[PDB]
Amino acid sequence: SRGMITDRSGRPLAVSVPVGGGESRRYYPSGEVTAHLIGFTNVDSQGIEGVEKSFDKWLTGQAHNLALSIDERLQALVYRELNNAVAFNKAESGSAVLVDVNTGEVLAMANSPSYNPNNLSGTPKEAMRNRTITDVFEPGSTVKPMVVMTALQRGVVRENSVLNTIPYRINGHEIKDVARYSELTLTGVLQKSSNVGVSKLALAMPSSALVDTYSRFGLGKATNLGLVGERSGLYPQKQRWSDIERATFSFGYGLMVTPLQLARVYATIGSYGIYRPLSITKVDPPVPGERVFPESIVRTVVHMMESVALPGGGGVKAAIKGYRIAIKTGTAKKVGPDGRYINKYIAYTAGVAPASQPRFALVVVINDPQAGKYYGGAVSAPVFGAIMGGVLRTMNIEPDALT
Ligand SMILES: *C(=O)[C@@H](NC(=O)/C(=N\O[C@@H](COc1ccc(C(=N)N[C@@H]2CCCNC2)cc1)C(=O)O)c1csc(N)n1)C(C)(C)NOS(=O)(=O)O
């Protein structure tokens, strides 16, 4: 008397198989591939984790079946690249979230390491944490597209403007890029991911500017998926800011976001400024959402984000044959247990695709890579192109770019 969980097209993800005659159990056909989102039961058909626990009442007849928003073909290829990229880079964990730009539907949600819900004996209480909703890390350079949007909105800068990116000092702390550049343009600021460029913008604006924009894209706001351990991130509510706090805010200092939240930011970028709620159940279109940023400004920055994936950007590794993509890379220094920064990194690559008319938002988070490279452009960017390349071609998206 236990309902069945399926993906958005009917594929079984949690079935009650009869074993032993009359008595039945619970089988998970995808296994580790979708473990964290799906969860598991006990011997009493009681949900303990994931969708199995969140919908335990609906799945017993207080019995109905539940069509998730996941596409198992997409979940499988997300997991295949994410799992083998955690291993290859010898990382602590890795998370990836794939969201439908037009409906906020979660088409995939994966972590490595994982566990097998068909035989969870020996697996501790960790490794059952859904990293996509429980990990909170500083977003780093991935917020920079929103800084350009705010600057264009507040009239501080115009599309064709050359910024002075020579290093400088704010109070005691100094600001410098990975590679020194005497000057840069807006498209160049995001291309090279210039910490100096965006910090100059953050100082020519009231501190409330970036606070308003980041929130309009969902940061610090709950995701309301209903799952266990779903964290809302740490968000600054400061009444007064320092000059160094405003500057480092433009490249991901002073806030912590879950991978699910960061995927919602890029679904709002790919919708050109429409903010839609996230869903792990198959939705009935339409999903109108709320307009949170002017369309013309987000399209302008979406186009700027293409040069990250083109020769010169810090994300050329993510390129895909025959498609335009608009992405942003990111590297964050991890915070230690004492509250100060250690020598461990979070490698990001977030983006939308295809750039001509984005249909999918994708986020790749690789926690603590230790194998030769540590920054997103070399660690998570090639994973982005592998996943998104598989996504665009599985979903039969018309090729975009002459390549
Ligand atoms: C954006 O996230 C931003 N970085 C930060 O603001 C934060 N930390 O920065 C770390 C330093 O990161 C890098 C160092 C070196 C390289 C690199 N070798 N790049 C080469 C360029 C030419 C082609 N080959 C590769 C890349 C990154 C640090 O902690 O020291 C940060 C923000 S919040 C927080 N806790 N940390 C930059 C530096 C722009 N990373 O962007 S990127 O796209 O990964 O390159």
Author numbering: 70 to 91, 164 to 203, 229 to 569
Quote the study that presented this structure, word for word:
PBP3 consists of three major domains: the N-terminal transmembrane helix anchors the protein in the cell membrane, while the C-terminal transpeptidase domain (TPd) is the catalytic module of PBP3 and mediates cross-linking of PG chains by ω-peptide linkages between d-Ala and meso-diaminopimelic acid (m-DAP) residues on opposing peptide chains. The catalytic serine acting as a nucleophile in the transpeptidation mechanism is also able to react with β-lactam antibiotics because of their structural similarity with the d-Ala-d-Ala motif; the resulting covalent intermediate, however, has a very long half-life (with turn-over constant k3 ~ 10−4 M−1s−1 or less), effectively leading to irreversible inactivation.
In the case of the truncated version, the presence of the compound left the space group (P 62 2 2) and packing unchanged. It did, however, impart a notable improvement in useable resolution, along with slight changes in lattice constants. Since there were only negligible differences between the two models (RMS distance: 0.37 Å for 336 equivalent Cα positions), we will focus on the binding of AIC499 to EcTPd* because (i) electron density was clearly more informative in this structure, and (ii) despite differences in crystallization conditions, the complex has been crystallized in the same space group as the apo form, minimizing spurious differences caused by non-conserved lattice contacts. As expected for a β-lactam antibiotic, AIC499 is found as a covalent acyl-enzyme intermediate, with the carbonyl group of the hydrolyzed lactam forming an ester with the side chain oxygen of the catalytic S307. The largest differences between apo and complex structures can be observed in the β5-α11 region, in particular residues K539-A544.
